[PDB]
Structure 1
Amino acid sequence: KRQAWLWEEDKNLRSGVRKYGEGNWSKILLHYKFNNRTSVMLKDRWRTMKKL
């Protein structure tokens, strides 16, 4: 089921990119809580954040 990205997931993604680096989606996924997301979904959300 399609799930909009919540504020806390967005925060974790940004924290993850600052610490682990842009592109290291799998590593980011392993260090923070996300709502049943895969590393591809993180990559995609990052692209959307840039667009917004």
Structure 2
Amino acid sequence: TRKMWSVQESEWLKQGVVRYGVGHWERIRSAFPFAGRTAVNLKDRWRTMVKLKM
């Protein structure tokens, strides 16, 4: 069952991009306690947030 992204998970990805730059998906995933999210999931999520103005 697919799981929608929480606003806390989205803020984690936002700070991880700030602290490490886009494309550093495996580095961002390790800097935050992401449970059930792969680095590819983080990259797809970032594309969604960019498109949704976030």
User: Structure 1 length normalisation: TM-score?
Assistant: 0.94
Contact 1:13–1:28 at 8 Å: present in 2 too? yes
Q: CA RMSD in A?
A: 0.7
Unaligned segments of structure 1, at least 5 residues: none
Residue 33 of structure 1 and its aligned partner are, at CA, apart by: 1.7
SS of 1:37's partner is coil
Where relative contact order (Cα < 8 A, 6+ residues apart) is larger, the structure is: 1
SS of 2:12's partner is helix
How many aligned positions are there? 52
Q: Percent identity?
A: 48
Equivalences for residues 1-52 of structure 1 within 5 A: 1-52=1-52
C-alpha distance in 2 between matches for 1:7 and 1:34: 13
User: Structure 2 length normalisation: TM-score?
Assistant: 0.91
C-alpha distance in 1 between matches for 2:10 and 2:25: 13
Residue 34 of structure 1 and its aligned partner are, at CA, apart by: 1.8
Amino acid at match of 1:20: Y
